[PDB]
């Protein structure tokens, strides 16, 4: 049994099942919880569930074929399983909050993408949408490990260390030293030597973030705003480390909307980027351009974060969440629509131990194991 809470908009019946549109506090989902999820995972105004069966539901807006499930129009107000998807295990969705594209990774390393095609972020070397997920051609001979979509690129690691993108190319986002959309996966050539063991993506004109087995943070990209980390607003085509993140600890790494965030092994959370409406948790909205440790959150040991597109959510390892940023569609989970400056504990889930959260773009979702 695992116990899934949501909350934030449900315009489009992306929390799977309420009533309302801004639910403000977090709220057992029924549907979810009985699904038995390993995974949910937050687009725009769409939300997607790996079950411990190595299945996929999806729910939320349909447009664009966002959701995968056959159709390009309307919404799906109850959790439906991506059935082109039934006869593989699959082992992770990965889409960006403000995304209308996502992937599907299988326990056995095959990739498939689905929903809007605009820049080649779906990799079959085309521009066109994709109701159901397709298998990646091209990445049929490598075993993937992870994968990552931003807002208009996509990537995908291997077990050996290899780093793909593909998308759009524009700012640089992709990595290769131009500014070329590239319709198939392209490895990064030039972080070759290091074993990149996570990526993020970004959304709009976007950053993109690697992490490899020694601890380096790596961000290009679009610069505005200091969300790559290194000061001023430059953006940048070819991977650059970070050096302040050096030595910390890193061990996730996720893309907001124009900013970025990392969590270590130690627990400390740094964010850095794009301040408008607070999403960075440092109490004030101006930009952040090296990473700056969220320092309400001393002391709070956190095991998992996730990122919306203007709200973080934090887990303790005693199963507290922690929300800061904007809360216009109730994503807070403070009960009313009132910004957290901070990082603020989230109500209603006391005698939950939550460990995982996950965002789409103002949405928010908290489950047990």
């Keep these: ?164 993108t593909w998308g759009l190319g524009e700012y640089g986002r992709l990595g290769h030293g131009d500014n070329t959309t590239q319709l198939k996966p392209k490895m990064v050539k030039v972080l070759l030597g290091h074993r990149v063991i996570q990526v993020a993506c970004g959304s709009r004109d976007a950053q993109t973030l690697a992490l490899t087995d020694e601890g380096l943070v790596f961000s290009w990209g679009d610069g505005d705003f200091g969300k790559l980390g290194r000061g001023g607003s430059e953006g940048c085509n070819i991977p650059q480390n970070i050096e302040r993140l050096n030595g910390q600890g890193v061990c996730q790494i996720e893309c907001g909307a124009q900013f970025s965030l990392a969590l270590t092994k130690s627990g400390v959370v740094w964010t850095w980027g794009k301040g408008d409406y607070f999403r960075l948790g440092h109490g004030s909205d101006v930009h952040v351009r090296k990473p700056q440790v969220v320092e309400g959150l001393r002391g709070k040991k956190i095991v998992h974060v996730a990122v919306g597109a203007l709200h973080c959510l934090a887990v303790t390892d005693s199963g507290q969440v922690y929300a800061w940023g904007d809360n216009d569609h109730g994503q807070q989970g403070n009960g009313t629509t009132t910004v957290n400056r901070k990082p603020t504990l989230v109500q209603g889930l006391e005698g939950q131990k939550i460990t995982r959260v996950a965002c789409g773009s103002s949405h928010s979702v908290a489950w047990t194991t």
């Excluded at 799977?16 to 995972?41: D, H, M, R, W, Y």
């Excluded at 807006?61 to 799906?76: D, F, K, W, Y």
């Excluded at 992770?92 to 689905?114: C, N, Q």
């Design 1 to 164: 049994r695992t116990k899934v809470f949501v909350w934030g908009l449900n315009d489009k019946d992306q929390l799977g099942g309420l009533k309302g549109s801004k639910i403000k506090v977090p709220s057992f989902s029924e549907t979810l919880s009985a699904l038995n999820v390993v995974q949910v995972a937050g687009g725009s105004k769409s939300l997607f569930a790996v079950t411990v069966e190595g299945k996929v539901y999806a729910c939320g807006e349909a447009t664009n074929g966002r959701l995968g499930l056959g159709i390009s129009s309307g919404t799906v107000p109850i959790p439906r399983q991506i059935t082109a998807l039934s006869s593989y295990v699959v082992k992770k969705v990965a889409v960006h909050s403000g995304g209308r594209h996502a992937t599907a990774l299988t326990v056995d390393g095959k990739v498939f993408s689905w929903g809007e095609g605009d820049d080649g972020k779906l990799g079959h070397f085309s521009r066109m949408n994709c109701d159901k997920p397709r298998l990646i051609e091209a990445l049929k001979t490598k075993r993937i490990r992870d994968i990552a979509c931003g807002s208009s690129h996509s990537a995908a690691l291997t077990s050996s260390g290899e780093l793909y």
